[PDB]
Design an enzyme around this catalytic site. Sequence first.
Site, PDB file in Angstrom:
ATOM      1  N   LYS E  89      80.641 164.657  22.470  1.00 37.61           N
ATOM      2  CA  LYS E  89      80.091 163.396  21.904  1.00 37.61           C
ATOM      3  C   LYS E  89      79.342 163.736  20.612  1.00 37.61           C
ATOM      4  CE  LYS E  89      78.321 159.555  24.084  1.00 37.61           C
ATOM      5  NZ  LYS E  89      77.577 159.016  25.237  1.00 37.61           N
TER       6      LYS E  89
HETATM    7  C1  LIG Z   1      77.088 157.827  25.329  1.00 38.82           C
HETATM    8  C2  LIG Z   1      78.039 156.921  24.558  1.00 38.82           C
HETATM    9  O1  LIG Z   1      79.402 157.096  24.820  1.00 38.82           O
HETATM   10  C3  LIG Z   1      75.744 157.442  26.020  1.00 38.82           C
HETATM   11  O2  LIG Z   1      75.899 157.598  27.337  1.00 38.82           O
HETATM   12  C4  LIG Z   1      74.907 156.156  25.433  1.00 38.82           C
HETATM   13  O3  LIG Z   1      73.856 156.703  24.918  1.00 38.82           O
HETATM   14  C5  LIG Z   1      74.222 154.825  25.998  1.00 38.82           C
HETATM   15  O4  LIG Z   1      75.299 154.286  26.644  1.00 38.82           O
HETATM   16  C6  LIG Z   1      73.020 154.417  27.012  1.00 38.82           C
HETATM   17  S1  LIG Z   1      71.198 154.179  26.981  1.00 38.82           S
HETATM   18  O5  LIG Z   1      70.706 153.461  25.957  1.00 38.82           O
HETATM   19  O6  LIG Z   1      70.649 155.535  26.843  1.00 38.82           O
HETATM   20  O7  LIG Z   1      70.939 153.539  28.158  1.00 38.82           O
END
Ligand SMILES: *[C@H](CO)[C@H](O)[C@H](O)[C@@H](O)CS(=O)(=O)O
Lengths: 217, 217, 217, 217, 217, 217, 217, 217
Positions: E89
């Site tokens: 990521k």
């Molecule tokens: C990755 C994106 O694919 C993560 O899991 C993301 O940060 C967010 O989905 C969640 S939160 O705001 O940290 O709840």
Amino acid sequence: MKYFLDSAILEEIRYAYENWAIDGVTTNPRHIMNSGKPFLTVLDEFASEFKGVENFPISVEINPHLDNAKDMVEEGTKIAKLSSNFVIKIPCTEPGLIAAKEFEKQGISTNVTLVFSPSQALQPARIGAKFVSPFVGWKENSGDDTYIQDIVNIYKNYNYNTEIIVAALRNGKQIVDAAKAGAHIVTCGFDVYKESFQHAFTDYGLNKFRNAWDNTV
Amino acid sequence: MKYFLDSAILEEIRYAYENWAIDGVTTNPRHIMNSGKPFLTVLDEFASEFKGVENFPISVEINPHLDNAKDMVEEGTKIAKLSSNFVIKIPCTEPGLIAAKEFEKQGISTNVTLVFSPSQALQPARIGAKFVSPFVGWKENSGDDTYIQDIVNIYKNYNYNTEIIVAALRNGKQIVDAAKAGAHIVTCGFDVYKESFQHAFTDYGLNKFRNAWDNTV
Amino acid sequence: MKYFLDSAILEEIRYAYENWAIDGVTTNPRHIMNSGKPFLTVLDEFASEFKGVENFPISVEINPHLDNAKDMVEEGTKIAKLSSNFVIKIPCTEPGLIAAKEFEKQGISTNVTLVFSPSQALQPARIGAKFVSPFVGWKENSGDDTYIQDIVNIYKNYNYNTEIIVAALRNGKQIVDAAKAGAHIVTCGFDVYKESFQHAFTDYGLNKFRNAWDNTV
Amino acid sequence: MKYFLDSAILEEIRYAYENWAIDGVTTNPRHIMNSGKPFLTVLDEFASEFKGVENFPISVEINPHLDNAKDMVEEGTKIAKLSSNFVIKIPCTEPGLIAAKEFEKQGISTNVTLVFSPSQALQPARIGAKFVSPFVGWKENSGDDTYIQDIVNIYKNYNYNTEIIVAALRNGKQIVDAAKAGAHIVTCGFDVYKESFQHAFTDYGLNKFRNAWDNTV
Amino acid sequence: MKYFLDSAILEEIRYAYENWAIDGVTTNPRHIMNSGKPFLTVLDEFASEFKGVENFPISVEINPHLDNAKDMVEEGTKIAKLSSNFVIKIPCTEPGLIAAKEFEKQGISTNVTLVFSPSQALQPARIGAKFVSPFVGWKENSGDDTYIQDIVNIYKNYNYNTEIIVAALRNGKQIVDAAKAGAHIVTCGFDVYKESFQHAFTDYGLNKFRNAWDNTV
Amino acid sequence: MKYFLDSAILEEIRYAYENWAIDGVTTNPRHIMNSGKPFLTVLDEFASEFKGVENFPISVEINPHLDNAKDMVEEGTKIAKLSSNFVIKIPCTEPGLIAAKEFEKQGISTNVTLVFSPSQALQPARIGAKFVSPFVGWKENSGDDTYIQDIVNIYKNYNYNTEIIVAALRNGKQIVDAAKAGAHIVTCGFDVYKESFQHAFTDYGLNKFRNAWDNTV
Amino acid sequence: MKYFLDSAILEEIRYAYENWAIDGVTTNPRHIMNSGKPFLTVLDEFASEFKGVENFPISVEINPHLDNAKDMVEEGTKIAKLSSNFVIKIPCTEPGLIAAKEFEKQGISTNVTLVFSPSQALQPARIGAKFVSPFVGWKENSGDDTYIQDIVNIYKNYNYNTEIIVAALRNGKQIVDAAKAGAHIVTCGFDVYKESFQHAFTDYGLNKFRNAWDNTV
Amino acid sequence: MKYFLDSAILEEIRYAYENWAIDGVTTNPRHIMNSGKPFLTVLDEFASEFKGVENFPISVEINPHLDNAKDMVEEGTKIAKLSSNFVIKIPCTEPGLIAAKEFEKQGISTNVTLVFSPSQALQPARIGAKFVSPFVGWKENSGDDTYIQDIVNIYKNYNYNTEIIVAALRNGKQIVDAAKAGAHIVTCGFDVYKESFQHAFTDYGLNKFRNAWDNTV
Ligand SMILES: *[C@H](CO)[C@H](O)[C@H](O)[C@@H](O)CS(=O)(=O)O
Ligand SMILES: *[C@H](CO)[C@H](O)[C@H](O)[C@@H](O)CS(=O)(=O)O
Ligand SMILES: *[C@H](CO)[C@H](O)[C@H](O)[C@@H](O)CS(=O)(=O)O
Ligand SMILES: *[C@H](CO)[C@H](O)[C@H](O)[C@@H](O)CS(=O)(=O)O
Ligand SMILES: *[C@H](CO)[C@H](O)[C@H](O)[C@@H](O)CS(=O)(=O)O
Ligand SMILES: *[C@H](CO)[C@H](O)[C@H](O)[C@@H](O)CS(=O)(=O)O
Ligand SMILES: *[C@H](CO)[C@H](O)[C@H](O)[C@@H](O)CS(=O)(=O)O
Ligand SMILES: *[C@H](CO)[C@H](O)[C@H](O)[C@@H](O)CS(=O)(=O)O
């Protein structure tokens, strides 16, 4: 919302006035031909029938062969002198709009008829015509959609006093369309008005309510 | 709704004023060229024709070569002193908008012309121009759609007194479009206004009504 | 998207064919009158100019006084025998639609012209007319809005092969409207096509690019 | 979706090609003036930089003073012989569209530029231009809304192969508008592309994620 | 429609995989901090838990302090070598998009995260990123409306293979919004998914059906 | 509709006030840096230039490093004591909105700036801020669409007196967008305002009118 | 537009009242449970904190086990006698709407809560409830869209005085949705209000303005 | 917004009047049959129950077998003399609309019922009927959509005093539809009104609030 009877038959004009509360009567050379009576006769009857009646406009079209605004103003002045309820109906032509401006300046109420566009409706409004009759049925018979809302909106936006008489109406759904637009008056034949007041679901419910009344003390 | 005659020919200005009730007259250097008369001559005739007539604006464009707001204010002051009906027409340019602000401050009515965007129309309104002429036909000839509703809506939202004169109109449907938008005035040539008052269905009905009249006593 | 030249002048037909790649030519009794040459002469010139040219339709209207479908089929058969590029143009009338059905059955291409409603356009399509010409300008001159999209949509929904030729076009914005609708062909005069290819912002940028080129080695 | 770099600077063309995967480069007489190098020099560098690179179009505008389609075809033939990646950029003028039709017939790729209406875009498509560049920024600077969707829809409805290059883009929201319309290519300066890849909320989240990483084993 | 569990807790990842059929797992530096276990430990557990499981993507964010695309490609190559289910990521930054292009060229699946505009989403798609995560919740917390439909439409119009993972989802109505748009995957916490499967009217009907069952033999 | 000059240069503030009738002046720490003069110097000049001028607001941002609402109220009280035309510009932060509420309670006009959502705009309105500056350009540069209409509608629905100053405007089309929304003021640089008053079609018509004037006596 | 703090914690009620200008406070049995203090204690503190404060409504829900409108009117009369700022919160049930009608007849302000449809909201309005709280968050958690505009429109169309308190709000975008609808009050937790006042682009601009201030004398 | 109980049972009329604040009662021959009491008995009870109650309309349908407007006016005059709260309900038929006009002229309030089109609703309004009952349920049972908004809009556009009573309502969503349209009154059975005041999410929240109250001192 005014309902004018588009008829030259006084049996239908008398009935609609006493039972449907019609607010006026519009006639055209074809309605007078179908009357079977001479034009001047139809006029004499209409003049006596509503001699005292006030606020009952009776639109009467002048000779359709008139081509000069001077000849139209002379013919429509004579017809207008036959009754205070008579409103001279003039076609939306160059000499008709010139004749409708002179008539309105002399205080003779005019109904600029045969208007089929919002551009043909605006000039009648600029010259102070009492009524402007935009036709719907004819254009529909030739596969055209029916500019009625545009005229209502333009008239309203520019604070015009001319009252719109949606004409050539053939069904109560076209009465609904004119009322939904905000048209001032709708002119229709006696049968268009009768059927507009009737519905099959009213006869269905009436039968359901007549069965219940019977099965009740 | 005002109908200004976009013409420099006094035979058409006289007719439209007596029969169509035109509310004003707009001219441009090309209309005066097509007049065949010298500019000052056309002006003298227009000044005498409407000497007493009040509320009859006569838009007259100053030298189109003027590049300084000081030279425009000197030329338009002279033209404005020829008749109280004359409204100095100035192009929407930096020096034209500067010259239109000085003119309006001295009480000389100005018509900021050649406006082709709602951003070019807002400045004329902020400086108190009497009229702003947004052009339609030219942009259409080059395949562009015609911002007219935006100007009307902006003018209304900010309570501006400047009156919008939709210009370069070529048909009565474009008159309908300006009226549906809420434009104050529409300037059009004599022939655009005549044809706008006519319809084929009016001639069709006239023939049907002329046949009925004949088959009637 | 086909661009047919609505002209009977062979200096404009020759230019547009060699420089603008026109795909065809449409003519009406008024374009031949303005040609200044006799009808048969204009036809002989058009027949020789495009003798071999294939896929270059040349719409030619028959006598407009013809009132019988039999007289129209005899006159249009003669005109069609003068060149394989000629397409007989017939008015959307009872006898015109009867004559256009007989013509199409004999293999003579027909252009049902003077169509002003989608109901008048559907019958030409049901009888296999090669072309149907819905007119726009005329209705607009009388303050009517211009059903063109309806015809395109109907033709498409029912898989009709008839090609729609939007006619009476007066500006490039009306060319844009026909192209946005999906019309097959657009017929326009030589000047409507020239101005449609031009824009003021192209001359503005050209001046900015000409100044830059000069301030560059 | 192609991203062409609207630049004549080879430090920005080299970077964008190796890091952003640009699919082509567009230049205009003003970009070459701002280069500070002579036109022929910029061309020699572009020809060598992408000597072997295939499918990398390099749009190069001919002399903007050229007024004849014959002079444009002679100048653009010479420029096109300097590299197989070069695409002659011609203004949307009468002689430019005549010169773009002759060029395309000889197999020289052309980019009809300075198009500001969908009517000016359709002719380039009818003559088989490889690219058509509709400009957005200029019209917006003059308070006009930006016809881009119309061109995309027309091109699609008539199965045209001409690829649309939305030009004069100044921000990534205008890149989003072109992509939402379906434009084939978008030409933008190096800085418009860099900022389009950045967002404040990406720096906010990065700080929140950098704080978490630190408070973690 | 894929449902990825946005969690770094293996008790919730194991449950959702066996009972809800989750199709993947996304994690961020904040989810690993809340795990209470060291990053490398969470990774070892995730690698063993799904050792053989195929088509189960496990998005793992690299060091958020990485500022160079070379340092990101070295760190993400190491993490990717720990399991074939791991998808690196990378934040939507200049060096992140440069590092995501190099990664995708070496065959390492990448999830360009922290995308908050459709312009920031298009570049990840042009470089062949396996996944692009547009965030919704964050922008909403700051009073912004959530461009998700634009990205789906752009991706579709240009036939991009990148799969959209709508992230920061907080309720099942935002799951409905992503599904109505056409998003490929939706990543949500365990509790967002549980509540999305429940409704008060299901408990109401259950009570009505439990009363009926009881009043029945 | 007010046009505030987003500039700290007094040659452009003097010109726009005498020729364009600007209604006010907005400045930010970046406009004062680009001035080349020290902050206190720019302020002294602005205070003297408009010493007597009434209803000419001059927005001046306080130290952007201020983190406490007490330190902001002490710094902005000093700046406000330098001229009655000065309006303290405060960022939309927790301590900025607390400092803007205290300032407004002491009768010091405040312009809550850096507002990028309608939720960030509502609190400034609830505390009686004189002005709220919603930024457009920045969000667009990052591919975001620009909530401006929402703020105008909310302000109107709840009868708020706070005047909206659409900021970061870069073209006259964005001025048209703010005017179409109903924004009270629009702040733009000197060049954005000049180009907004100009159009290519005004130069085209000017050339057509200059040719006619010449071919006329 | 009123902002009520949905909290039973007096450290957050005191802060929001002195810094955010909250216009009231709403509490539910779950907010009092999370307070950690006994219900009567929370009430005594709220009664003293705002003893004199006028126009500061403090919604307090009665025993949720109450099933009779007589038992609710006896319990809510006692709670209402503890402070003039207290507004008895009653669930939208048959006995709650019967108890809310009796309460309103005795002059005790009532907040009919747990309303999830516009039909459940109309009865509270017909009985003169001071407040009606339509819940949003709960329905969204179960994948339902959120009828709020319908209630606002109905209340307005029938000139009802009942003030709508949109409840269960979780983000500032849902505050924007309630304000765009025309809701009178919005009740939210302390953190929903803080984040609604913040934006990442405000921190971005602050950094750009802090860099400029530093590079300036 | 008035809620009339569509019932002839006085246990339900008494309850709804004391607990739901019903504003009136409508009955039809089928509701009196289901009462089990003779028609005159139901009337005597209704007359005594609301002897003094003012502004409590009690619509009572006359013999459904009546076919003459004279027989209807004689029967409805007798029923109207039994109580001042009684409103004669007449079917929308030719003789019903003639009988409703005579009744309204004598000062007897009439409710023209069984109206299933906006054309059948306009005549009742032109004759000054006190109430017009457009039916919804029946048309829906036969797969028809339910013209209610048209009647409300027409009534409003022409300033009619007739109050619209949407009838045959079967659920609270159809009550929401009538309220969203602007209907004056809605007539529904006792059970339609009870269920309209209830929601499953109110029972869900009540359970969550009852659990919290218990886990609290
Ligand atoms: C990755 C994106 O694919 C993560 O899991 C993301 O940060 C967010 O989905 C969640 S939160 O705001 O940290 O709840
Ligand atoms: C007058 C217009 O006000 C006439 O009565 C009109 O012609 C038409 O309404 C009717 S029809 O086509 O002759 O039926
Ligand atoms: C003045 C504007 O108020 C002029 O009369 C204008 O130029 C145009 O209306 C007409 S045209 O293009 O010259 O026909
Ligand atoms: C044939 C239609 O296909 C004609 O050329 C047509 O009449 C019109 O297009 C033109 S005009 O009104 O005569 O200009
Ligand atoms: C070519 C079009 O394909 C050019 O590069 C174009 O002029 C403009 O894109 C840019 S600018 O206005 O000069 O910035
Ligand atoms: C004040 C807002 O009222 C400023 O002048 C503002 O920062 C921006 O308008 C302009 S820019 O981005 O710095 O150009
Ligand atoms: C009262 C309504 O006016 C309460 O405070 C309400 O329950 C909810 O707003 C909040 S939550 O779901 O408990 O968060
Ligand atoms: C009177 C109308 O005002 C009646 O009560 C009506 O018939 C219907 O409302 C009801 S049902 O279909 O009989 O249920």
